[PDB]
Design a protein around this ligand. Structure first.
Ligand SMILES: [Ca+2]
Ligand SMILES: [Zn+2]
Ligand SMILES: [Zn+2]
Lengths: 145, 9, 388
């Protein structure tokens, strides 16, 4: 629980993930801001996105609640910033670490799955590349930059 | 609800 | 046995199909709870289907697998036997009490057992029999040294082996052992059946003295009894709280299911969260829940097998230890909670953590081991000696 979140923040500093990072906001160990740099595989390249991470009292047995604070254009990301990654829901398991959730989101950022989207409009488009790349690229210019 | 119940204590 | 070809397999299909039809008779009115045959047989067919489609033109090497062969000859002898239980049963089939009906009930169970085994051996449809994980360390160790990677062995080969390790007193006690451990009633011991039995009868340390005491000399042990039959048998005792019996659980094979009559006159059944049977019995008794085995005033003393020889403490090798100084932690601590030392070992995977965490993950609806996600078929309580 509390100790686990403390081990995690500790393990995250020792060896961290590339293109991202995170840590507590203020004195509250259950709220973290996390940074995700735009992968080069992806259209968001050169962008900086921030997320909130809320650890429920059930954590590690329930997953953390992760959401994008910075606007993004994705078929798997809500305007609410809710993310559709599966290991955030059915596929979560207690030994998973925040670094893995972060990598998994970059992995999702460079390879979105439209067959299970969070945005019906961008699913249809994604599954016409030229228009989907173009707009993702632009939203990053307004919002990420 | 498979017919089994928690152990008596 | 003999080799298995598509032409044969289509025959098993018809035989299973007849049995289905014989069991859909409106006079029979089979109760729908497991084991329930109109579930078992079609699901077996289904899994048989999945298995076949996975071997394409490779049906060559599927028919030559010893386990598959023994299984088909046994599935064939078991339907033939059920179809013949109908011809010679006539109308005695529609009396819930008849000896013939009792034999159908025993067959339903054998079918559930066969299906559980099949799926233990061909989980995704592909033969996994050679890598099958025996749940108990010391039991797995016995099977490996004795039979290597074999999936299935003759009962004679099995008795000879086990005797060298766990002496069998007589011929009678061997028949009793056979009847107990051969769940598919085929005259072989699969690595799957071996697993069930040693799960049920742990600790491996004294395996027979355990099984002697929980089955051979115990009036509470009911063999090849259904959930419903356990309900029916306790009824006679519903006026006498404290009366219990226990059997194998058919839906979770390798687990015990204890039926009992409550102080208020209801019959409950419970499956002990992984723990050894004798302790659930000893505690149950001591706490007043399990008093009268099969309703008899006299209840056996199990404190004999109480403390087995303790599983040796785990000791950390310098090379392992030094890493956890680097990792900014200590080897013996639960990596789930980072709080308690690891007091528990998950089997078969091997992973260590604290019982407090394993419980919370299970109660949270979580599937399997929290690390590898593999199935949890066992738990061995343990204590670590830090390398310091
Ligand atoms: Ca057998
Ligand atoms: Zn723990
Ligand atoms: Zn594991």
């Amino acid at each position: 629980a509390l100790k686990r979140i403390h081990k995690e923040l500790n393990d995250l500093a020792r060896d961290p993930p590339a293109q991202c990072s995170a840590g507590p906001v203020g004195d509250d160990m259950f709220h973290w801001q996390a940074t995700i740099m735009g992968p080069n595989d992806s259209p968001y390249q050169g962008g900086v996105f921030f997320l909130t991470i809320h650890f429920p009292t059930d954590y590690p047995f329930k997953p953390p609640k992760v959401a994008f604070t910075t606007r993004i254009y994705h078929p798997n990301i809500n305007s609410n910033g809710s993310i559709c990654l599966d290991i955030l829901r059915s596929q979560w398991s207690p030994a998973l670490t925040i670094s893995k959730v972060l990598l998994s989101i970059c992995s999702l950022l460079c390879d979105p799955n439209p067959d299970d989207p969070l945005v019906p409009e961008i699913a249809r488009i994604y599954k016409d590349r030229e228009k989907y790349n173009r707009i993702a690229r632009e939203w990053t210019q307004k919002y990420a930059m | 609800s498979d017919g089994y119940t928690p152990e008596p204590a | 046995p003999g080799t298995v070809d598509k032409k044969m397999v289509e025959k098993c299909w018809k035989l299973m199909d007849k049995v289905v039809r014989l069991c859909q008779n409106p006079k029979l009115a089979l109760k729908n709870s497991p084991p329930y045959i109109l579930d078992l047989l079609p699901d077996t067919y289904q899994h048989l289907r999945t298995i076949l489609s996975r071997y394409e033109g490779k049906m060559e090497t599927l028919g030559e697998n010893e386990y598959f062969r023994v299984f088909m000859e046994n599935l064939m002898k078991k339907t033939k036997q059920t179809i013949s239980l109908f011809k010679e049963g006539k109308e005695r089939m529609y009396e819930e009490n008849s000896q013939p009906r009792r034999n159908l009930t025993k067959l339903s169970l054998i079918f559930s057992h066969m299906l559980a085994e099949l799926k233990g051996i061909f989980p995704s449809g592909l033969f996994q029999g050679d890598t099958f994980r025996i749940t108990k360390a010391d039991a797995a160790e016995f099977w490996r040294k004795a039979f290597g990677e074999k999936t299935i062995v003759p009962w004679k080969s099995f008795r000879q082996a086990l005797h060298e390790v766990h002496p069998i007193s007589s011929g009678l006690e061997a028949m009793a052992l056979k009847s107990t451990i051969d769940l598919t009633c085929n005259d072989y011991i699969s690595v799957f059946e071996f697993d069930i039995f040693t799960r049920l009868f742990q600790p491996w340390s004294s395996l027979l003295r355990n099984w002697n005491s929980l089955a051979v000399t115990h009036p509470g042990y009911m063999a090849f009894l259904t959930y419903d039959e356990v309900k029916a048998r306790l009824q006679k005792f519903i006026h006498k709280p404290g009366s219990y019996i226990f059997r194998l659980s058919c839906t979770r094979l390798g687990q015990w299911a204890i039926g009992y009559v409550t102080a208020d006159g209801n019959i409950l059944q419970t499956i002990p969260h992984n723990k050894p049977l004798f302790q659930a019995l000893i505690d149950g008794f001591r706490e007043g829940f399990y008093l009268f085995p099969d309703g008899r005033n006299q209840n056996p003393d199990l404190t004999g097998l109480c403390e087995p020889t303790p599983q040796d403490h785990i000791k950390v090798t310098q090379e392992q230890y030094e890493l956890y100084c680097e990792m900014g932690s200590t080897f013996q601590l639960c990596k789930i909670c980072a709080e308690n030392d690891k007091d528990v070992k998950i089997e078969p995977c091997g992973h260590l953590m604290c019982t407090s965490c394993l419980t919370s993950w299970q109660e949270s609806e979580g599937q399997g081991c929290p690390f590898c996600r593999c199935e949890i078929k066992g738990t061995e309580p343990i204590v670590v000696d830090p390398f310091d």
